[PDB]
Amino acid sequence: MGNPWTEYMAKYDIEEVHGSGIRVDLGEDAEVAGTQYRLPSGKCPVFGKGIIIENSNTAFLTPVATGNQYLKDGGFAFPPTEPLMSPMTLDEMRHFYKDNKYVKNLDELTLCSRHAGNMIPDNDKNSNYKYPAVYDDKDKKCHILYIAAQENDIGAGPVASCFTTRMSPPQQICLNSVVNFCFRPAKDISFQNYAYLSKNVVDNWEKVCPRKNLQNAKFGLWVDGNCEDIPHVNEFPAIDLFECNKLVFELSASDQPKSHGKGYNWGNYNTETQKCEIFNVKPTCLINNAAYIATTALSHPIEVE
């Protein structure tokens, strides 16, 4: 008795390896100056996730609107600071943290998450509040998100104008201007190179988190020596894998006002019938079926292993 798949399938136990929402990650609370704020806390990167702002062509990685000029407009990212903390290229990150012996042998995504986590909302220097970030794998650039909300208590953090570094010797960094609208998370083709990163992304995410989809494989449940099919699935039409991953993402665990990672996080994509079969039970084995690709809401929407 027992399940021979246990070790290989640990990557797909979303409740354990990720532990928070996927579509909307607001799995923790942090105090800043006596006030509690929700913020993202998932331990895995979410590949291909971005935010779409309604009634706008403004990209969500545009810095948040500052000042009070007519037509002021912006996105979710940190505005300019002195010195400039965001966006920061991978090379800039490696050089500015060159004196921190612990950043060596951090991978690109982890380094971005830790850079974002360096800034403390200045009102509470003992605060556990850490901003999320988006890493652009194309331009190799890290964007700190000033607004942690993802759909619209909704994750809008403190209205901080000044920040202190967790890294010593401490530096204080303030915004160069004052900070001053419906939106939703999504996997868009234009987001395919992005990774959405909470403060909790683990150093070894490459080994414990799902990234690529599994070809010629179908998620199943281990039942007395056989890999049975998932008992209850929701079937949708999907012209290709990207559309199926987009759908799984839309239905996945969401903390929008805590999921703790529970939701419709997995999909079996039938490349022959062009059907996406989405379910909300953790899979415990894989079925050898040439027509299928197995995907999760966390996974890159296109890449296969």
Structure tokens at 106: 């951090």
The coordinates were experimentally obtained by: X-ray
Resolution in A: 1.9
Domain ranges of the chain: 4-12+212-252+264-305, 13-211
121: preceding bond cis by omega (within 30 degrees): no
Angle (nearest 5°) at CA 92 between 57 and 145: 40
How many other β-carbons are positioned within 10 Å of the β-carbon of residue 135?
Answer: 26
Would you call 243 helix, strand, or coil by DSSP? helix
CA dist., res. 208 & res. 244, Å (int): 23
Q: Beta strands 141-144 and 133-136: pairing type? A: antiparallel
The residue assigned the tokens 């403190």 is: 158
State the DSSP string of 119-152: EEETT-TT------EEEETTTTEEEEBS------
Would you call 103 helix, strand, or coil by DSSP? coil
Sign of CA dihedral 279, 235, 189, 38: negative
* Burial environment of residue 72 by CB neighbours within 10 A (0 to 12, 13 to 18, 19 or more): exposed
Question: For 24, which DSSP code?
Answer: B
Asked if 129 contacts 35 with a C-beta cutoff of 8 angstroms, the reply is: no
Question: For 170, which DSSP code?
Answer: P
* Burial environment of residue 83 by CB neighbours within 10 A (0 to 12, 13 to 18, 19 or more): exposed
Closest residue by Cα to residue 190 from 141, 151, 136: 136
Beta bridge partners of 163: 121, 173
- Helix residue spans in 145-274 (DSSP H): 205-208, 241-251
* Burial environment of residue 138 by CB neighbours within 10 A (0 to 12, 13 to 18, 19 or more): exposed
Would you call 249 helix, strand, or coil by DSSP? helix
CA dist., res. 121 & res. 90, Å (int): 24
Would you call 189 helix, strand, or coil by DSSP? helix
